[PDB]
Design a protein around this ligand. Structure first.
Ligand code: Q94
Ligand code: Q94
Lengths: 410, 410, 410, 409
């Protein structure tokens, strides 16, 4: 027997030669993108073959073997329906149905405190999925850039804990939700910020990363880190958003001097420079598609699912998911964890970074926020997703009533 | 083919007839107890047969089938290592190690609030495990009865949500932790108690169960419900503990009058009668073993693992586990959620009810409490357990660093 | 020389004999009532002579001498304009003017929680004045009984401090206002009630008076005090108000149990008996006239102005006025202290006990309350009164701009 | 009759002529100082005559009249013992006794967060009195300059209310104590600072004064105002303290940005410039003597007692005294109002501005603070003062037990 050959028979279906487009179509229906970085060798060999043998686009067993051999393990997992969601085409038709239903929730107000979020349409709406195996689906406006805003807070906390360790980080920042109306206090009773998901805690965490290097390199270093998280998909930067947040962030300067006074930063911190860095991190741009891969790295124990790259330690990913669970959705965190039961993080640009641990990462984006700061269409979507599927942190994988389990077959 | 007979060969082990103790010994090592309620028919058949032939008590092929036929599906899974923890004997060896290391943490103070919890010794320490498949293990004082105290709160919340539904129950009680800076208030700003896991919230939940029938019938009904939850293992009642709670609950009467004044009860509530019921519910008695089965029902979507009976709705089991996650360990809940990442609920007699969703339920019991009200030995055990195994709610099942995964074979 | 003689000449106006009605009229215009207890002997002899000498009604010097001889010292201050408010007839004309302007403020809502406070009319409005010299004036419904409610709180604190001393009393009760965003906590950070003017503070103070005797004698003992303070004018009791206060005090029972749990009462306290005592003290009845004398006793360093009797120690009167100043008007205390600057205490029956130190005491009563619990017409009157006269705690006696100073002549 | 003559005889005591030193001694014992601004003409006339007749410096009726005639009403009130405290020398003898007992209270910590308060001694201690009539007494270190710090807060509040009115001022700042469980929030529920006596409230009040003018002119105007309040006694400015407060007011910059975000300032406010102004106001220097005169203006309805000038509206002085009562001694405010019952304001340099309305103004100064920020010797002194004299706001002037009433004979 031979593994390149058994797959050949699986697809050849008693026929002699495989039309190459027939191979591509079977590949895509698994959820894999033909541009998947782990498939470069296979696609490079196929494109070359349609040059070298420009008569009739047929693969025999000998030719099939040489094209798929380098990436054979992944292709068998895809074709032997071993991915986390085996019937991916079924699942995405549900995602599309939830997407369309959320689309009808036309309420909410686009954040307009700087002229740059004001220029976004209320009608922009996109959802992107990347599973722990790299299966991809997008619907709506998933290639429109927008800033991460507070959706960067879990990412940079994950980075700090990865590089510095649990102990160090949490000498400077707490690990609990504050209390449904301690939203106005910057510090807990230990004179630490409550958690990394509130502005004061993120500001403290911004001040822990890559100490002793200047702001240009600190930024470069985080960007390089986010690029790996996103499997090298779009990660960008809005200088415009940066200028407007720095010229209008009185509240963040208030946090900054308060934290300095109460000595909350590591020694030798230049607070106002740290505030500058913080404004930059919030103006990093993503798309729905690229950001979904970042959340999938967090769903996948810190390995980027579309590259196989270890990005973050398991410790960083667990802490981040733990604090996204209780602290990630502003004053709605407690209601969200109860009804949705998934780690998620919202930002004022209307994004929600969603993690279904061991299954998939998602980014939903609709700019209109509700009175709590959370995107109306996104929130509506994340209730539906958990109401349809047994993805709630405390659903049971064996007894789950009328809910759907996309990880399973029949 | 025949499943009773291919099973016979796996155990007969090329030989002709099976000595019955060889079958019993093999059975026990899967984790199953000979007393498993789902095995009665088979055990009844052995009881008949080992009566008939006290010489040549060995089971031939025909006779083995005759005893095992009725429970063959369950015996096949046990013997083909299909249970959630396949190598259960190794697992209990780690449980026994965690037990001994917790056993040496001699700190803490026995609650000295009543003469009935005061009469318990600091040296009592017990841990009991029941998986979602009914596999059982105990070490220490796992058959010593003790009162549930606040470990009854998730159970009575479970029943209430089971009988009335999420929406109704939460007209009366919130669903978030208050904040370690609002542990002293009885009501949130919506004038409901913060969650069901605190005294004010539990008192409100007591008032929703079986309204309009008297308290004698309500107690019977809760006991019958707890009986299904523990698969009819030990559930009792301490009148002594009840009397001492009834003369020592000034704080509970303060709560009761405050809730009545603010109209927090359903109409037709007799507040002073509800407090009496509440004091009884806190004096329901369990062992580590029976209570471990109660937790396993919560690990298993509301189906009792040693009987197969559907006891609680999934909605009931999900809400309860969500609120044990953030509110179950007094002021230590936020730290416990971060570091342990399991639903747990502690009580003042030294019990900690632990749920590992889709894996197991446990009860740890040591009366000596720490300064926050939590069992010292219990708390220490629950750290080691998650430090050893990837049972943390947000550990990754694929990349998990140095931890052990008992669900795996190799 | 002789005082009976020059006083005789003062009234005689060069004439030989004084018509007795002329003496009565001059006396009344000073503010004194002919029924003033300090004038009994003089009035007894005048009435006696209008019997013995139905030939008259003229008084020559010797007969005037024998009637006034007993009360001559006070009659001289009355007639030589030595009282705190010399031109008393002018002053009452201004009181009447303020009464009428307050009379037109028809807003507010009568207290409606028990059947006995609901039954008081919005049209009742009365103001009664008693200076520190016994000068009296009334306007409106000043002889209608009503319950003191929280206006008894300063009185019983005064008794407490009088009998036990500042240090002892304030081991159990604080001396500060809670903070306008702390109306809902029963205890300050030292686990004492904030001050004696809140319900929990009054409940603690009720428990300090005449410890170890039963409730019947404790009550009599306090009533006996209120009689002396009111110069033996009407002090009564509403059993009806008492019964409904005890059937509607869920919150007060909530306070009592909370206070017992936190060990806030003196040892040997029967908390539930103390609550009944407190409900009794709140149903003590006065009129505006008798209660104005109680306030005048507080304006007078603890001496009753219409009897000359020492009732309360100065230390007791000072502490009380300090806490009526900052804590006396529910959530309006800080605004009232800023804009009115007078010691005052409001109650839910529509009373406001007002003290102008060294000048007079007052009682205003109009049942309609405002959203903070304070009598609407009462509040309006005390603003106008201090806008008219330099009575504000921190007005100046030399420079006072547009204001009138009734202590002055021309 | 003649007013200069009846006074001349009371002082002459039936004798020929009054020796000039004998008239001066009688003056000093009333409490008045020979430098009292309201006595300048009489003193100017005395210095003129002390040249003409440089030998036997006796004043006869005719010559005495020539010196006192211009200031006769005030000299008559002083010599007929019509002042608020008639036996002032008795009263000051008690002040000295309270001073010495407080001096033995050696505890507390000199504030050291800026090097300019660090450089002060723990043993500095002075008390100064100026009555509503200009009677003066000092004991201790009453001519040593020190910064006002938060004891300026009521003064600049008084100015704002004087110039802009109660309504306007309190559109921006509350009028209540927060509650000993709110000293850490900058804003009350209406998103105003709780009162003008806390830092966030004073920072806002700084922003109301003399708007639209630059900081140089704003400071000048407050100084000119303070000069009137203190009857032109010592008022200065410490540049050093200013530099250290501006380089270390991270908490104050935190307050400023928070207030800016919640839009608590009047339109067109330059916040960072307002903070600079605020640091300046807190580095104004006084002595116990000059500052005691400022407090006497507040005890006297806004009239400066040693000049007769109307300085503050009555509305300004009452509001100020009301909030000094409840908000003036940091977390000790509620305790101070209960046991002392006088408007007072303390600052971190160890000063306490004390007002007994209608009686006197006072300044106590000892740098060592207690754990709440209040001067230890000052706090001890004002407890003793009210334990001895019926000065508590809610003492009775008629029935006051064993206490002293310096207003009576
Ligand atoms: C919206 C809201 O706040 N609702 C409430 N729920 N419960 C409340 N107070 C109960 C009753 C009185 N208790 C307390 N008094 N004092 C305290 N604090 C301290 C330092 O002693 S706690 C406990 S208010
Ligand atoms: C109505 C209202 O809420 N008004 C407010 N005013 N000011 C606020 N917050 C400022 C800025 C953040 N500060 C604080 N953080 N943490 C604290 N307490 C502790 C124990 O750490 S105080 C102070 S909220």
């Amino acid at each position: 027997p031979s593994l390149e050959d058994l797959l050949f028979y699986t697809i050849a279906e008693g026929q002699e030669k495989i039309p190459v487009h027939k191979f591509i179509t079977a590949l895509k229906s698994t959820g894999l993108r033909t541009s998947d970085p782990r498939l470069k060798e296979c696609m490079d060999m196929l494109r070359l073959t349609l040059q070298t043998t420009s008569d009739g686009v047929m693969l025999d067993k000998d030719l099939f073997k040489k094209c798929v051999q380098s990436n054979i393990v992944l292709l068998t997992q895809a074709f032997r329906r071993k991915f986390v969601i085996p019937d991916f085409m079924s699942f995405t038709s549900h995602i599309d149905e939830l997407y369309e239903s959320a689309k009808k929730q036309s309420g909410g107000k686009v954040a307009d405190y700087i002229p740059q979020l004001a220029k976004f349409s209320p009608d922009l709406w996109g959802v992107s999925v990347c599973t722990a195996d790299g299966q991809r689906h997008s619907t709506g406006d998933t290639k429109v850039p927008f800033c991460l805003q507070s959706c960067v807070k879990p990412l940079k906390y994950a980075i700090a804990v990865n590089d510095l360790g649990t102990e160090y980080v949490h000498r400077y920042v707490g690990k609990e939700p504050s209390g449904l109306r301690f939203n106005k206090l910057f510090l807990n009773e230990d004179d630490k910020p409550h958690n990394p998901m509130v502005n004061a805690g993120a500001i403290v965490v911004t001040s822990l990363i890559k100490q002793g290097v200047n702001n240009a390199e600190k930024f470069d270093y985080v960007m390089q880190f986010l690029n790996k998280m996103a499997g090298n998909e779009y990660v960008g930067f809005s200088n415009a958003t940066f200028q407007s947040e720095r010229e209008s962030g009185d509240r963040n300067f208030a946090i900054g001097y308060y934290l300095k006074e109460k000595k909350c930063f590591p020694e030798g911190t230049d607070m106002v420079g740290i505030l500058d860095f913080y404004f930059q991190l919030c103006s990093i741009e993503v798309t729905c598609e690229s950001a979904s891969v970042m959340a999938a790295t967090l769903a996948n124990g810190g390995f980027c699912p579309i590259t196989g790259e270890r990005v973050l330690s398991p410790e960083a990913v667990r802490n981040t998911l733990s604090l996204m669970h209780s602290c990630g959705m502003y004053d709605f965190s407690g209601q969200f964890a109860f009804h949705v039961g998934l780690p998620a993080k919202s930002g004022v640009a209307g994004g929600i970074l969603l993690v279904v641990p061991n299954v998939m990462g998602m980014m939903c984006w609709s700019p209109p926020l509700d009175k709590m700061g959370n995107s109306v269409k996104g929130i509506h979507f994340c209730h539906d997703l958990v109401s349809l599927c047994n993805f709630h942190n405390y659903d049971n994988l064996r007894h789950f009533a009328k809910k759907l389990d996309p990880r399973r077959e029949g």
